[PDB]
């Protein structure tokens, strides 16, 4: 039993109350869905390859909409905490639960995303991936960032949260920022 969310009577994986999400890593290097980079250009502002930034399931992204540019939930902030589990042979449990705040600047979508994205519903509606989570959150580690959180896609408890006020101040500068 790695993962160590049990799923409630709608299927949907809890820990002590709270809810859980899937995570994954990933680069590609784009700007992403919430226009962290220069407008109009592909290029991401520094800020937005190096720091814990992330990429949830599309449905959590557009809060239930399938935009996939300015979501609803652009630039969100989620605490992570680890549970010490994760899905078997599909990650690994970290060496600490330390929590750690990653803001949303981009959107994994269902397409081309299935085992982990692949949600239909946002959370609240008691959908979930193959995984049995009601969200996802796909990190990026184009620095290493995620590698040196030795994060082996970990079960973890999400919450939202204030944005710390550097995550703030990176994304004034996004175009979505009042969209």
């Known amino acids: 039993r790695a993962q160590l969310c049990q799923p409630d009577a709608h299927g949907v994986r809890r820990f002590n109350g709270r809810p859980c999400a899937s995570t994954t890593r990933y680069v590609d290097g784009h700007k992403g869905a919430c226009g962290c980079g220069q407008k109009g250009s592909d290029t991401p502002f520094?800020?937005?390859l190096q720091k814990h930034v992330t990429a949830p399931s599309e449905r959590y992204f557009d809060d239930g909409g399938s935009n996939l540019w300015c979501g609803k939930n652009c630039g969100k902030c989620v605490r992570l905490t680890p549970t010490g589990g994760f899905v078997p042979g599909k990650g690994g449990a970290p060496p600490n639960h330390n929590p750690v705040v990653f803001m949303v600047t981009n959107a994994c979508p269902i397409n081309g995303n299935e085992e982990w994205c692949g949600i239909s519903g946002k959370p609240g509606t008691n959908h979930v991936n193959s995984h049995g989570?009601?969200?996802?959150?796909?990190?990026?580690d184009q620095v290493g960032q995620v590698e040196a959180l030795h994060w082996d896609n970990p079960e973890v408890t999400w919450e939202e949260v204030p944005c710390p006020g550097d995550l703030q101040a990176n994304y004034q500068q996004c175009e979505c920022h009042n969209s």
Do not use: M
Request: aromatic content about 28%.
């Open 46 to 48: 520094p800020w937005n």
């Open 133 to 140: 989570y009601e969200v996802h959150f796909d990190l990026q």
